[PDB]
């Protein structure tokens, strides 16, 4: 019906912001479920899904119209715990942005809790839901594994300049580049793991600048895209004028 346009801009970063909001992202590599659950870190890998309350078909529901109209997720129908996945995105042309992963998770996924910090971006959901959300974030162009690496605490590096091989300065290294392809063993929480997870080959610097959603005076300056500054000015003028008098 209403074809969502999602964002203003004829530029490249407007197109990439629309691609992150819409979810029309191409898959660059693959992560198995067994080691993805390992690097989320809330569970033994390849084990049963835990619980925080008995499943909804057993302990019933109140007589609610929203409950009978909204079909709960499969990850909530089994009463899983609410656990989290979070990332850190560089300011040197990372493909995703702490707001724009939150916009991605809000539009493309049912029953999530996206949260934006300046350096952190968290998705909190039921077990089977956040696993799918984190899987879709990891296997696509949305996460550049050299850039948008999973942290769960001690996240410093969104604004720290990259290393010479294009990886963030992590005060506890989850992800290491050697062997050619990027590999990582720990979960987002700062505990080590026995198994090694290959992600894939990192994007090149020019490909990172092409795929990014950051206006940068190096690559695509914010000042030259008047289409989005007009959006900011229009919504700000409407906010101020209608906070004086809404007519």
């Amino acid at each position: 019906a209403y074809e969502a346009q999602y964002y203003p801009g004829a530029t490249s970063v407007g197109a990439n912001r629309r691609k992150h909001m819409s979810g029309k992202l191409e898959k660059l590599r693959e992560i198995s479920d067994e080691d993805l659950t390992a690097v989320l870190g809330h569970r033994a890998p390849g084990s049963d899904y835990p619980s925080t309350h008995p499943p909804l078909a057993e302990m019933g529901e109140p007589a609610c119209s929203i409950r009978e109209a909204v079909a709960a997720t499969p990850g909530a129908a089994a009463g899983d715990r609410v656990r989290y996945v979070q990332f850190a995105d560089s300011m040197y042309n990372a493909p995703a942005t702490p707001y724009f992963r939150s916009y991605f998770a809000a539009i493309n996924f049912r029953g999530v809790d996206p949260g934006t910090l300046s350096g952190r971006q968290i998705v909190e959901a039921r077990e089977r839901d956040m696993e799918q959300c984190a899987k879709v974030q990891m296997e696509t162009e949305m996460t550049d594994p050299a850039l948008a690496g999973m942290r769960g605490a001690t996240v410093h590096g969104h604004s720290v300049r990259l290393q010479e091989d294009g990886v963030m300065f992590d005060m506890l290294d989850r992800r290491r580049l050697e062997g050619g392809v990027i590999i990582m063993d720990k979960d987002q929480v700062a505990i080590p793991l026995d198994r090694k997870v290959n992600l894939g080959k990192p994007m090149s610097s020019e490909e990172a600048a092409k795929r990014t959603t950051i206006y940068r005076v190096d690559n695509v300056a914010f000042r030259d895209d008047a289409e989005v500054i007009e959006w900011v000015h229009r919504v700000f003028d409407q906010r101020t004028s209608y906070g004086f008098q809404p007519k």
């Binding site: 909804l56 929203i66 409950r67 109209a69 909204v70 079909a71 709960a72 997720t73 909530a76 609410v82 939150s102 916009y103 809000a106 049912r110 029953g111 999530v112 809790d113 996206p114 949260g115 909190e124 959901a125 039921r126 839901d129």
Partner: peptide, 18 residues
């Protein structure tokens, strides 16, 4: 839509915002 999907009360911290 965002709270009945998760059956969780915590989603309106972000549902209104986003």
């Amino acid at each position: 839509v965002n709270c009945g999907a998760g059956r969780a009360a915590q989603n309106v911290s972000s549902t209104l915002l986003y």
